[PDB]
Structure 1
Amino acid sequence: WMPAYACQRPTPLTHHNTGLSEALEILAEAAGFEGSEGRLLTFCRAASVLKALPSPVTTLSQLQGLPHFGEHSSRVVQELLEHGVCEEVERVRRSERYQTMKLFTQIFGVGVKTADRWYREGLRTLDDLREQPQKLTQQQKAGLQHHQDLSTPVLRSDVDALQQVVEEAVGQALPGATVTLTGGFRRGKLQGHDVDFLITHPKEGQEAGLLPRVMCRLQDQGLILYHQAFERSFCIFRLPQPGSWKAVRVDLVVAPVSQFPFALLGWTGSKLFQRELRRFSRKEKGLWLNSHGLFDPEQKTFFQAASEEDIFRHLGLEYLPPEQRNA
């Protein structure tokens, strides 16, 4: 009744089991902070199953037969159904480890391994990190300086303004080039932690060398607070606000038009949706999927796709619009 891969089922942005999925996602996050990738994936997948259900889970029997619910995930749900709280989840939430790893990994430039090393050195607060800049990269320095703004949700209102500004620079860098909104906003989210754009040009090959030209133009307009031949840029942008401005994370990616469907699919996400789709591709269909293409390793050939619809058809999956990829 419920297929086992998230790419086999529609997952809307808002759903009927918000509280249950949020709890499982706490345990998933905590597993990641400990390096337990398998447990992170199971808890993420169990959470996603609940997002795909057509109505609220009210009784434990409704978990019977659902993929990715075993003893542990089912006990979490049972406790939430019976008591409104799961003791394990609440213990994680208030733990010094969870709170500090979350605070540290939320920094742009800091991943689990860096956060964990700082944790073991006894560091606990952003001010702890500011006092020891000897230990910070230029990227991490930027992430820490801008941390407060970057912690403030980006709004869909902000996105339209940013896109016009990116389009202006893109059009000077390469007339005819296009800018497409991707990531969470393309899936219908009303706010986000960053804004994701995919850039291409209708004439194959004309996109070569494009992103340095775009970045130089944005920098000359005073709009770049931070950035690093390249085709992906992870920037911090200066975004107007009434009488002031705020820093916003923006990701720019260039793809040749031949690869655009694959890049659009990949950069539209969700992150879990894409991992599940690539796992499905490889394990169920024997095809290797990434944001550049879809490879048949028996015939040693790449599938040509003109659309995301083509890619779903290639993989034998019913098409899901971006708004239903919120796994």
Structure 2
Amino acid sequence: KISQYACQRRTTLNNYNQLFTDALDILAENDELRENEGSCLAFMRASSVLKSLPFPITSMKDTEGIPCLGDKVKSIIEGIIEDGESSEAKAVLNDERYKSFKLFTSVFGVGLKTAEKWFRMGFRTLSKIQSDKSLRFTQMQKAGFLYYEDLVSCVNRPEAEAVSMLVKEAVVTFLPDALVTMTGGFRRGKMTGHDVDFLITSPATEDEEQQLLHKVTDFWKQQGLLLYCDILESPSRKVDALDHFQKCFLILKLDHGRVHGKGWKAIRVDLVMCPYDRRAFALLGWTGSRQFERDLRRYATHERKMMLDNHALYDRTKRVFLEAESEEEIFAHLGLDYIEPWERNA
């Protein structure tokens, strides 16, 4: 019935097991900070498989037949079926390491290692951190502190629609033939997001594309609507977290009047530039979710003896690179039924 793979389950934003998944998300994040990568992912898969259920769990008889639920997970569910609360998750939420890790990493530029550095030093608040002379923050870390309250108050659908109008007009100006598609959470029909993602491709000067990202940003800097900027340069690809595509991580100023206190709002924007021939691979890889993508790869590997990434799909048996002009072709190659963006919310 139900598959252990996120790519073989239709997961919508209509969750009936929110009580359970919230508890499991906390328990995963707890093993994330302790670097217990195996345990972390176990709770990530249990929480993911539950978000796919077309009904709410009311009894233990309901869990039977559902994969990714072993002893530990079935007990979390057992604990919630009665109380209506998780004693495991309510414990983690009241832990100093966790509270501080969750807090510190919520800053743009701060991750696992820096949060652990600050916590070991004896820090617990972002205020005592900011008011220290002995410390030295990066260009990401300074921007993260500067626009904290605005980046922490996650983006909304009208705000994302204002950004997508601004990004398209600026990209359309320096390149008119280019197709610009909004990726990430907002492509999967989300209402709230941490950031706004985009994919840029034009059907195509090898020299012109390389200037595209710089053309649109410098143009936004001339208007002074570019608060933060960082650009990155562009077979059988593996052990590479982020793809080999040209890309940029920005913080842009969104004037209140463009979206239908101070008159502004800092918004996190990710732009990705890829060759036209890779459009399908890039879109699939940037739509997400995290759990859908990692399972797409895990499926290809373990079930199809193939190699999936954001650039291509390689069949090891037939020793050929399977091309695609759409997402539907990549799914068909993998022998997976099509799961449209809105149902990739794993």
The answer to whether the 8 Å contact 1:223/1:237 transfers is: yes
Residue 285 of structure 1 is matched in structure 2 by 304
Aligned residue for 1:189, secondary structure, equals coil
Is the CA contact 1:204–1:256 (under 8 Å) kept in the aligned structure 2? no
Aligned CA distance change for structure 1 residues 178 and 223 (closer, same or farther; 3 Å): farther
Q: In the TM superposition, what is the alpha-carbon distance from 1:268 to its structure 2 partner? A: 0.5
Whole-Å separation in 1 of the counterparts to 2:6 and 2:320: 26
Residue 209 of structure 2 aligns to a residue whose secondary structure is coil
CA displacement, residues 102-150 of structure 1 (integer Å, 9 cap, x when unaligned): 0111111111111111111111111122123633111111111111100
Find the residue that maps to 2:68 and give its secondary structure.
coil
1:77 aligns with: 77
Q: Give 2:254's aligned residue.
A: 239
- Paired residues, number: 327
CA drift at 1:272: 1.0
TM-score, normalised by the number of residues in structure 2: 0.91
Per the TM alignment, residue 256 of structure 1 is displaced from its structure 2 partner at its CA by 1.1
**Does structure 1 residue 320 correspond to structure 2 residue 335?**
no
- In the other structure, the counterpart of 1:256 is 275
| Residue type of the alignment partner of 1:238 | K
Structure 2 residue 239 is the aligned partner of structure 1 residue 226: no
Structure 1: segments with no counterpart, 5+ residues: none
User: Residue deviations 1:47-69, cap 9 Å, x none?
Assistant: 11111111111101221231111
Which residue does the alignment assign to 2:214? 212
Range moving further from structure 2, 129-138 or 95-104: 129-138
Per the alignment, residue 302 of structure 1 pairs with: 321
Greater shift, 292-301 or 186-195, is seen at: 292-301
CA distance in 2, matches of 1:240, 1:198: 23
Task: Give 1:12-31 correspondences, 5 Å limit.
Answer: 12-31=12-31
8 A contact 1:170–1:178 mirrored in 2: no
Counterpart of 2:44 in structure 1: which amino acid?
Answer: C
Give the equivalent residue in structure 2 for 1:113. Answer: 113
Corresponding position of 1:201 = 202
Task: Output the CA distance in 1 between the equivalents of 2:105 and 2:166.
Answer: 30
Amino acid of the residue matched to residue 187 of structure 2? R
Matching of residues 92-107 of structure 1 within 5 Å: 92-107=92-107
The structural deviation recorded for 1:299 is 4.2
Alpha-carbon deviation of 1:161? 1.3
Root-mean-square deviation (Å) = 1.5
Opposite residue 94 of structure 2, the aligned amino acid is R
Q: Give the structure 1 partner of residue 240 of structure 2.
A: none
Deviation, 1:296, is 2.3
CA contact (8 A) 1:233 1:253 kept: yes
In the alignment, does 2:330 pair up with 1:311? yes
1: CA distance, partners of 2:297 / 2:153 = 32
Is 1:223–1:239's contact at 8 Å kept on the other side of the alignment? yes
SS at structure 2 position matched to 1:250: strand
Deviations 1:229-249 (A, max 9, x none): 631111001011256011010
Tell me the equivalent position of 1:269: 288
**Is 1:86 aligned to residue 86 of structure 2?**
yes
1:294 partner letter: L
Say whether the 8 Å CA contact 1:183–1:268 is kept in structure 2: yes
Contact 1:184 1:192 in 2 (8 A): yes
Partners of 1:101 and 1:115 within 8 A in 2: yes
SS of aligned partner of 1:236: strand
Q: Which amino acid aligns with 2:29?
A: E
The 2-side partners of 1:166 and 1:3 are apart by 38
Amino acid at match of 1:189: K
Q: What TM-score do the two structures reach when normalised by structure 1?
A: 0.96
CA spacing shift, 1:170–1:87, aligned 2, 3 Å: same
Distance, in Å, in 1 between the alignment partners of 2:129 and 2:274 is: 37
Structure 1: how far apart are the matches of 2:321 and 2:178? 25
Aligned equivalents of 2:16 and 2:86: distance in 1?
19
Q: How does 1:22-171 map to 2 (within 5 A)?
A: 22-132=22-132, 134-171=135-172
Contact 1:173 1:217 in 2 (8 A): no
- Render the CA deviation track for 1:149-188: whole Å, top value 9, x for unaligned: 0011211101121112111221222231222111000000
DSSP 3-state at the match of 1:176: coil
Q: Is the 8 Å Cα contact of residues 11 and 324 (structure 1) preserved in structure 2?
A: yes
